[PDB]
Design a binder for this molecule. Sequence first.
Ligand SMILES: CCN1CNS(=O)(=O)c2ncccc21
Ligand SMILES: CCN1CNS(=O)(=O)c2ncccc21
Ligand SMILES: N[C@@H](CCC(=O)O)C(=O)O
Ligand SMILES: N[C@@H](CCC(=O)O)C(=O)O
Lengths: 259, 263
Amino acid sequence: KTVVVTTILESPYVMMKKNHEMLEGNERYEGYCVDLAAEIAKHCGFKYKLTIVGDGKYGARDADTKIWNGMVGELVYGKADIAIAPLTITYVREEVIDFSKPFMSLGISIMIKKGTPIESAEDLSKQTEIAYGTLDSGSTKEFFRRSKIAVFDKMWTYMRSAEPSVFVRTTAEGVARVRKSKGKYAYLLESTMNEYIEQRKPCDTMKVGGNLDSKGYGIATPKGSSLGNAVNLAVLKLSEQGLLDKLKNKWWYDKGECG
Amino acid sequence: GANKTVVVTTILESPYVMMKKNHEMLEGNERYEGYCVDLAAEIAKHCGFKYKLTIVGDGKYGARDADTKIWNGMVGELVYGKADIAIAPLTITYVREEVIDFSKPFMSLGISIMIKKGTPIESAEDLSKQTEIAYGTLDSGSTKEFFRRSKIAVFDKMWTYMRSAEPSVFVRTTAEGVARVRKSKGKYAYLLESTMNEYIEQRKPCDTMKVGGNLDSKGYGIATPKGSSLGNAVNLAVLKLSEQGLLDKLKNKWWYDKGECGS
Ligand SMILES: CCN1CNS(=O)(=O)c2ncccc21
Ligand SMILES: CCN1CNS(=O)(=O)c2ncccc21
Ligand SMILES: N[C@@H](CCC(=O)O)C(=O)O
Ligand SMILES: N[C@@H](CCC(=O)O)C(=O)O
């Protein structure tokens, strides 16, 4: 029957089409992950229904209740059959759900308003005039929380107690905060999203420094799902045919507005 | 039953696995050093097994004979039950995933171009549009298969040339490709993984360089026979080492910290 796909509104991965209010079902949406879902479904031979994750989150486990939220929770608790989204492969998630081989590479990166005197994470950690933070309920925040790497641990110690909160509910809110804070806020986000925004009007942000880590997004399934093997082979087939590169070029470079 | 020493297949490929100085008087795992030797030790510690490193007999990564359908190389060692795990720069591919299991990648790479410094080549398109400079790949690996299978015009054109070139543009080992670049006065370019390319660019006599972008994007994984009980633990260990920053430290250790071409 119809495979329930959980995904998340995150540009350019999944976006509402122009005039979506008169559209229905999968046709409401467009983007990299919408295209990828169609390709994966064709290769594996299933029909599917795109559903936007109810709580709008990627997935974290509450320290006390030990309940998972976000897309990870939807998989864990049986609300969706598969997640096709910019969902980061991590140790803690691999303990509770399955991931395909990665379909896209990324690392944590720094976004600044152009002209901000920051070149690195070390720079951020050694000052206090420029505030910085991350997305809530995602892998970037969990990276800093868990990290024993000295610069990142120092950064976490500042971020977790900063007032007002330096954490944001959505990627778009982080970007807006960079753009509105006259250089006094820098946002820690994945290189994929940073690079997309850097090529969008008003062309006032940039990625500075190297990436802080190296990882990937995978297609996720509940542990022991029958779909896992076919989905993994489909990712590798699309990779080897060059279609993942084509999709990246379509939704990043072609979406470029800054010349 | 009782714990058994895990047989690890690997390959003599610098800087992943190399003969130590004084290897002639050393035994067992102590004979070897490198990135994958260090990685093996970390994986074994995390998963709680003892192991024996064994260099693959035929010195190949792994390809399936089109006629006999027999796998050679490290892939073959796993398929036919001669090794329990491969800890090596073994590329994750579709055809290999059909017959063995891979961890999540522990290193990223892409196919790339190695030239002798000063060679007037900047891209694969450049190579494809001329005949003065020969070019080829390693035998029995994923780079050769990439060109054989590609439907992208430039890479297909490159394959049509390479497959029929005389004398043969293919090499049996990475070292042979490097020698051919170094000795051919700019008239041979070598197609190899970016990891290997970047390593050699930091070795004396500092006469090669990587040019252009990478032609694809993939990774190396730790491989096990299909359905092996080791796979889950090994995968979690790769991800833990990744998150801890240790894979990045190992890359720096073996590529750059003792690079020979300056700071
Ligand atoms: C080698 C670090 N790494 C860690 N393993 S991973 O999260 O599957 C991943 N995916 C894509 C690129 C790199 C990568
Ligand atoms: C996203 C392309 N890709 C394809 N899947 S892969 O071979 O597991 C891989 N590993 C590391 C980095 C990239 C990568
Ligand atoms: N890709 C992340 C969300 C973005 C972020 O945390 O920066 C995740 O899967 O949690
Ligand atoms: N890593 C490759 C070998 C090197 C190459 O083909 O360039 C493999 O696993 O086949």
